[PDB]
Design a protein that fits this description.
PDB class: membrane protein
Keywords: membrane protein
CATH topology of one domain in chain B: Immunoglobulin-like
Chain A: Integrin beta-3
Helix content of chain A: 10-25%
Structural class of chain B: mainly beta
Assembly: dimeric
Oligomer: heterodimer
Strand content of chain B: 35-45%
Largest sheet of chain B: 8 strands, mixed
Shape of chain A: elongated
CATH class of one domain in chain B: Mainly Beta
Largest interface: A-B, 55 and 68 residues
CATH architecture of one domain in chain B: Sandwich
Strand order of the largest sheet of chain A: 4-6-20-19-14-17
Shape of chain B: elongated
Number of helices of chain B: 5
Structural class of chain A: alpha+beta
Distance between the termini of chain B: 144 Å
Entry title: Cryo-EM structure of integrin ITGAV/ITGB3 complex, conformation 5
């Protein structure tokens, strides 16, 4: 029967578009009165709504920009692309959805940036001695994995303030290690050492001039160093088109946010770059540690992949921490850091092994889901990532987007990107809704009687207390405008009980079996007789209970034909002139003659 | 719900963190009351002390003047010449302030101390306790435990509290390699053993926690504390927070308040959420069992997209008599807001009987100025939806305002009957006091006893005229009550509307009697007592012809308003209405429904049927008229519809039209859910006590040989809310078998004249001409009956010879349709090449007989037998037969032996027919 698009009785094109995606709106001025204004496109089009007046917006997804996925890259960047398509145009109706797919590939030789952030508590003297040659060896090992490399360095101990700092007799201010009769640098929060550079030997030349320091308590203020290494991009030299590695080597647990309150530090971490011309961290002594929530935000923003190269005794702790920060991994750093190089290479190997998507700037009105095709021609609903990818592999995802209502702003753009990659797919959404026939509405034009309504899409949307297609009726006016013979006979209902009258005109409401018509709703197109289960035998048109049979058919049910071919005799005359053709057979009037053509006697 | 938003604002010296820690001050020696606010970074007048800090007590009304408390004015004591014993500079004095009656306790967590044994700078911490007059210094951690492994870094005073029995509770998070500690002492002992010349006083009654295994280092036990009895012994037990315990999960310890044994351990769920940052204990459900609240500012929740986001969380652990707690969680509302930073019990804020709690988000809200949420307790626990949201009103100056970072409540500053709130905003160096508005509960009892109005009851006169109108009455009542200080009389302004539903822009039909208006208002007074201040009035309707919306009920609507201005106290504190008040109560009336006293008409939907025919012959497909009348002698029915069901083999031809003494109908057909139902409309309304006789036409294309009767069902339904549908009824007619075969036969020619022209006798014939004129026959057979028959027989008898002389001779026969034939004598027995009248036939003549089989014939199906014969002229030309006219006769018959509809009664059908040929003489003898 009639669909919600019709039975919900929406009086505006915009309302109909919100009723359901399948509803379609007609703006034809010549639409017959009572014809369903809005309905499923099939039904309404069957009602011959002009294509010049049909309104039926439909969701679509058009790719605006698409560079092919790069194959080797690593040289003459020329837009090394790892995500396709790059830009998509999307549009949707209040209750619609669309499917679009994103393809991700990991270039084999993509450049790399390694920043070595090394804790320098007094226990790390052996590690510092060990890693002196990490430069050249790292370059030779990585050259098997990428043709361009950049190496940096940095160190951190803890906030140089009591209770962490040794404020013990003045010697401890200039040589905190004087207690055990050794010389070491006065502790510090974080000092940048070496900007990222292609010249590897500079790493060796610099790391050989460093020294450890000493602090009182066991936890270390690494997270300050991590935050400063993420946000101070120009000091450290993070590249735009490259892979970012932040190696964080420590042998002790860390202070977290709100640990500074034990010192005189209450101000939170705003997450800004405070490294000055001096390569130290200025705001160390006046600013709390960063929360994990802020660190993840900054890491995602800057496209940093952070590797926890921690010792055995705290591997579990940092594993549990990394469980909260996407993109990180943990490795067992030996007590003397002898295996830092292999740890770095393996961590890079298993960091490139996974692809995961992030959605950012997604508006509230929108919501979307994912299907993954990671290892073979397979589909994994819901999951947004892959767990066993080989470098150089290609991955695909299918994205389903959903919306609610026509928001206040008609256009919004958001970005879908994989974790840690500069490349991104920006989806710009063009939200519905509007209709051409409604954009051309006439405010209170005389198309509506004495105004009393605004014309749009062939119908006057009437004002308060006003009713009718032309606002010819008003509830208040119904009191003085006493009805006069709404039906021809006094004592009978103002109309056929299928409807009532306003200002002497009957309103037939609605019907499911057909369309109501007539001055008093007393005629329609579904009350005629039936034959063989079909009204008027499918050979006539019903009208107010009468079958208007086609020219080739007659009778009340239109079940009998007037065709002459079957009744024409061999002489070219019907029934040989002896009878009349009825229902395709001749009835003979000449005495003694009989047969379908009066040929027998 | 009831906190004001026009508070009293206090300000301190710039950059002094004024407002870091706040609380009230309630002396027993004076009627006045004062606030206490800490300024941990304020400068003081002590010799050579930089940013020593101070605590200031601020008057409530005397221009909100804030004045420092002179706890002490000395500098660093000298253990020896130019050998300072203590370093008061940057000691953060005033970081935490607590008071109880004339007692004030303030602490300096960062106070540094040079131990006697070895010159050092260890942040041991200290606290000053000031009685009503006397002032002393309480530094429990300043002991011989100089090393960091002992108590050198206790930072005693990081958090503090008072028990019911005047026992101090003090926490130091740095003791024993930052394991933490929890130290308690009797106030009387503290104020009775102080001695300036003794630096490490050994108190007798004190009890404190002790060292544990190194696995527990960096736990920060004592980061936050509270008190409340859980042992059930009536003595307060200590609550403390351990934000770094259990691999940074965070833990909360409850210690027995009598001998310091452990009672319970709470464990956080998420890593690094800093569970236990702040704790509080108050009975949130009025069960007399104190509940526990624990804050986790950095807890990371994950939303719909699955991304973890830092919003903060607070855990509520109701106490239960069995000793176990019932836990639920409460998450924040904004990212990085650090919801749960401060948890301050408010006491029974609205005096509804259940204690209420406020939880702070000092970094949330627009521009991140800070926000405070108010939660109301209830019997079932805490109401998870905040009932109020205080917000900051200052901008950052190098520092986030941190409004709500520290709070205090549960003290009635102005004796208005309700407690109040102090909120610290040390980020902008401010403290703000919110006063609780008295809560007034009201009740409305609007009612209209003439709920249904009879138009004929025009008893009341229209004012100003003798015309009488059907009137209607309205009564409305109010009463107000509330705790605390309130005027004994309250002024309420109230509003009334009679047909508010027509406020869409239509004409209202109901009007007040004297005011002749659709809306009315009244300004009335109530004495804040249990006596209801009812009022009454009269209203009437417009005339009957002025409206027709009988079904649409009239809407009665009311609103009431407080005159807050007149009800405010001397300080301008407006009252407030309770939260859950239906300030827009309403009623309705029914213009009037047909059934009178009852809106819901309960039609006695009823139906009876009649039939024009009682049996249907299979295969006829002839229309038949079924007669049905709907009566529903009971109450009226609205939108009554008729439902009829027919089988698949049946079709609904339509409504009857040829009958003038029978009512027509509007009818349709439905097949939804693969059904075969006919639908007809009776009318709206179907008048009560009425009978509507109508009829319908149907036809069945039944051809099955197994069915024997039809199934026909009927029902009536309406839109009425009660007695909606009629019971199902049915009609029955049996199927019948009627097959009617016919046999006619024919001859050509039917008469002959003798002698045959140019004919002569012969010894024996060889061709047709040797015999005489040709005679031909056709025996057509067809089933004119509607029903089919499976098998039938046909028979023919022929007068072959008379007196051994042939009369008629058969040459050959042909068959059309499904028949086969056999003869008792060889057809073409001689194998010839292809006045009064005497009667001859098989009864006297030698008879030749033919029998034929007939197969199944359906309606109108036919088979034909054709026969050709000759007339024997020789027999009539013989001497003994000359000049005599003869008539030749033949007969045929049939029988229907079998029918296909075995399941129905079956019987054979038979009949007979005759054909004749006449012979006469043309050249007759002369008369």
């Amino acid at each position: 029967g009639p669909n919600i698009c019709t039975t919900r009785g929406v009086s505006s094109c915009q309302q109909c578009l919100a009723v359901s995606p399948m509803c379609a709106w007609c703006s034809d001025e010549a639409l017959p009165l009572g014809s369903p204004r809005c309905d499923l496109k099939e039904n309404l089009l069957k009602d011959n709504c002009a294509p010049e007046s049909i309104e039926f917006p439909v969701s679509e997804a058009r790719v605006l920009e698409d560079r092919p996925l790069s194959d080797k890259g690593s040289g003459d960047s020329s837009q090394v692309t790892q995500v396709s398509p790059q830009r998509i145009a999307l549009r949707l109706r209040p209750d619609d959805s669309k499917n679009f797919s994103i393809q991700v590939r990991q270039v084999e030789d993509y450049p790399v940036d390694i920043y070595y952030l090394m804790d320098l508590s007094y226990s790390m003297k052996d590690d510092l001695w060990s890693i002196q040659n990490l430069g050249t060896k790292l370059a030779t090992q990585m050259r098997k994995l990428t043709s361009n490399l950049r190496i940096g360095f940095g160190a951190f101990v803890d906030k140089p303030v009591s209770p962490y700092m040794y404020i013990s007799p003045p010697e401890a201010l200039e040589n905190p290690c004087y207690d055990m009769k050794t010389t070491c640098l006065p502790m510090f929060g974080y000092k940048h050492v070496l900007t990222l550079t292609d010249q590897v030997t500079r790493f060796n030349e610099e790391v050989k001039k460093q020294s450890v320091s000493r602090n009182r308590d066991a936890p270390e203020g690494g997270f300050d160093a991590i935050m400063q290494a993420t946000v101070c991009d120009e000091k450290i030299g993070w590249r735009n088109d490259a892979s970012h590695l932040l190696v964080f080597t420590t042998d002790a647990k860390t202070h977290i946010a709100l640990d500074g309150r034990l010192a005189g530090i209450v101000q939170p971490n705003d997450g800004q770059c405070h490294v000055g011309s001096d390569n130290h961290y200025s705001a160390s002594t006046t600013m709390d540690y960063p929360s994990l929530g802020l660190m993840t935000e900054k890491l995602s923003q800057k496209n940093i992949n952070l590797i926890f190269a921690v010792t055995e005794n705290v591997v579990n702790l940092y594993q549990n921490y990394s469980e909260l920060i996407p993109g990180t991994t943990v490795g067992v750093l030996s007590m003397d850091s002898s295996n830092v190089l292999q740890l770095i290479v393996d961590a890079y190997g298993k960091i490139r092994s996974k692809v995961e998507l992030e959605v950012r700037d997604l508006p509230e009105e929108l919501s979307l889901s994912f299907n993954a095709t990671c290892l073979n021609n397979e589909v994994i609903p819901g999951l947004k990532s892959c767990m066993g990818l080989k470098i150089g592999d290609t991955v695909s995802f299918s994205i389903e987007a959903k919306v609610r209502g026509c928001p206040q702003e008609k256009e919004k753009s958001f970005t879908i990107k994989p974790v840690g990659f500069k490349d991104s797919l920006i989806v710009q959404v063009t939200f519905d809704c509007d209709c051409a026939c409604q954009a051309q509405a006439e405010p209170n034009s005389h198309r509506c009687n004495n105004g009393n309504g605004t014309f749009e899409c062939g119908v006057c949307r009437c004002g308060p207390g006003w009713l009718g297609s032309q606002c010819e009726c008003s509830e208040e006016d119904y009191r003085p405008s006493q009805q006069d013979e709404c039906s021809p006979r006094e004592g009978q209902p103002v109309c056929s009980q299928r409807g009532e009258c306003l200002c002497g005109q009957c309103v037939c409401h609605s019907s499911d079996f057909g369309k109501i018509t007539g001055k008093y709703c007393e005629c329609d197109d579904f009350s005629c007789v039936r034959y063989k289960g079909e009204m008027c035998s499918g050979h006539g048109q019903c009208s107010c209970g009468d079958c208007l049979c086609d020219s080739d058919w007659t009778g009340y049910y239109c079940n009998c034909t007037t065709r002459t071919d079957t009744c024409m005799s061999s002489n070219g005359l019907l029934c040989s002139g002896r009878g009349k053709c009825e229902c395709g057979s001749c009835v003979c009037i000449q005495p003694g003659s009989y047969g379908d053509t009066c040929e027998k006697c | 719900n009831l906190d004001v938003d026009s508070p009293a604002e206090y300000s301190g010296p710039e950059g002094s963190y004024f407002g870091f820690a706040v609380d009230f001050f309630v002396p027993s020696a004076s009627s006045r009351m004062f606030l206490l606010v800490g300024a941990p970074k304020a400068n003081t007048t002590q010799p050579g002390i930089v940013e020593g800090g101070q605590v200031l007590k601020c008057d409530w009304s005397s221009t909100r003047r804030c004045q420092p408390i002179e706890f002490d004015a000395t500098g660093n004591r000298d253990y020896a010449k130019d050998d300072p014993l203590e370093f008061k500079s940057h000691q953060w004095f005033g970081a935490s302030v607590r008071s109880k009656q004339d007692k004030i306790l303030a602490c300096a967590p960062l106070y540094h101390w040079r131990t006697e044994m070895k010159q050092e700078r260890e942040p041991v911490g200290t606290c000053f306790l000031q009685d009503g007059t006397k002032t002393v210094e309480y530094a429990p951690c300043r002991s011989q435990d100089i090393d960091a492994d002992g108590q050198g870094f206790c930072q005693g005073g990081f958090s503090i509290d008072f028990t019911k029995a005047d026992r101090v509770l003090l926490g130091g998070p740095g003791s024993f390699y930052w394991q933490g500690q929890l130290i308690s002492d009797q106030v009387a002992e503290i104020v009775s053993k102080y001695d300036p010349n003794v630096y490490s006083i050994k108190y007798n009654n004190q009890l404190a926690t002790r060292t544990a295994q190194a696995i527990f280092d960096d736990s920060y036990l004592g980061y936050s504390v509270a008190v409340g009895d859980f042992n059930g012994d009536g003595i307060d037990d200590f609550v403390s927070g351990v934000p770094r315990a259990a691999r940074t999960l965070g833990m909360v310890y409850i210690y027995d308040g009598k001998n310091m044994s452990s009672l319970y351990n709470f464990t956080g769920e998420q890593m690094a959420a800093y569970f236990g940052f702040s704790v509080a204990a108050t009975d949130i459900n009025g069960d007399d069992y104190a509940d526990v609240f624990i804050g986790a500012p950095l807890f990371m929740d994950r939303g719909s997209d699955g991304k973890l986001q830092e919003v903060g969380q607070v855990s509520v652990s109701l106490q239960r008599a069995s000793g176990d707690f019932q836990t639920t969680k409460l998450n924040g509302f904004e990212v990085f807001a650090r919801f749960g930073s401060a948890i301050a019990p408010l006491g029974d804020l609205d005096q509804d009987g259940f204690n209420d709690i406020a939880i702070a988000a000092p970094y949330g809200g627009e521009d991140k100025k800070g926000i405070v949420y108010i939660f109301n307790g209830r019997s079932t626990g805490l109401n998870a939806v905040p009932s109020q949201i205080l917000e900051g009103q200052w901008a950052a100056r190098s520092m986030p305002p941190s409004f709500g970072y520290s709070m205090k409540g549960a003290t009635d500053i102005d004796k208005n009957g309700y407690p109040d709130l102090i909120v610290g905003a040390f980020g902008v160096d401010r403290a703000i006091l919110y006063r609780a508005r008295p809560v007034i509960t009201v009740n409305a009892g609007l009612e209209v006893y003439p709920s249904i109005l009879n138009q004929d009851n025009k008893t009341c006169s229209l004012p100003g005229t003798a015309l009488k109108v059907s009137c209607f009455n309205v009564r409305f009542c109010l009463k107000a009550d509330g705790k605390g200080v309130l005027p004994r009389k309250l002024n309420f302004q109230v509003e009334l509307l009679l047909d508010k539903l027509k406020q869409k822009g239509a004409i209202r039909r109901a009007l007040f009697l004297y005011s002749r208006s659709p809306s009315h208002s009244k300004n009335m007074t109530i004495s804040r007592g249990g006596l209801m201040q009812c009022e009454e009035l009269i209203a009437y309707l417009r005339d009957e012809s002025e409206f027709r919306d009988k079904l649409t009920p009239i809407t009665i609507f009311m609103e009431y308003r407080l005159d807050y201005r007149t009800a405010a106290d001397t300080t301008g504190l407006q009252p407030i209405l309770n939260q859950f008040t239906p300030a827009n109560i309403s009623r309705q009336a029914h213009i009037l429904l047909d059934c009178g006293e009852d809106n819901v008409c309960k039609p006695k939907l009823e139906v009876s049927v009649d039939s024009d025919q009682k049996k249907i012959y299979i295969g006829d497909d002839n229309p038949l008229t079924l007669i049905v009348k709907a009566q529903n002698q009971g109450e009226g029915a609205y939108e009554a519809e008729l439902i009829v069901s027919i089988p698949l083999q049946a079709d609904f031809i339509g409504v009857v039209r040829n009958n003038e003494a029978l009512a027509r109908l509007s009818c349709a057909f439905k097949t939804e859910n693969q059904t075969r139902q006919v639908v007809c409309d009776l009318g709206n309304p179907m008048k009560a006590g009425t009978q509507l006789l109508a009829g319908l036409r149907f036809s069945v294309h039944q051809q099955s040989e197994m069915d024997t009767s039809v199934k026909f069902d009927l029902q009536i339904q309406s839109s009425n809310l009660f007695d909606k549908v009629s019971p199902v009824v049915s009609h029955k007619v049996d199927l019948a078998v009627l097959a009617a075969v016919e046999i006619r036969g024919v001859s050509s020619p039917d008469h002959v004249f003798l002698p045959i022209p140019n004919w002569e006798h012969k010894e024996n014939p060889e061709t047709e001409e040797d015999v005489g004129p040709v005679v031909q026959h056709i025996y057509e057979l067809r089933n004119n009956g509607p029903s089919s028959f499976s098998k039938a027989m046909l028979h023919l008898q022929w007068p072959y010879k008379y007196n051994n002389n042939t009369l008629l001779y058969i040459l050959h026969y042909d068959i059309d349709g499904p028949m086969n034939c056999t003869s008792d004598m060889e057809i073409n027995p001689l194998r010839i090449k292809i006045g009064d009248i005497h009667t001859l036939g098989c009864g006297v003549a030698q008879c030749l007989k033919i029998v034929c089989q007939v197969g199944r014939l359906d309606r109108g199906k036919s088979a034909i037998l054709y026969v050709k014969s000759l007339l024997w002229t020789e027999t009539f030309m013989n001497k003994e037969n000359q000049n005599h006219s003869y008539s030749l006769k033949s007969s045929a018959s049939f029988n229907v032996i079998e029918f296909p509809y075995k399941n129905l009664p079956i019987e054979d059908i038979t009949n007979s027919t005759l054909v004749t040929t006449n012979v006469t003489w043309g050249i007759q003898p002369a008369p």
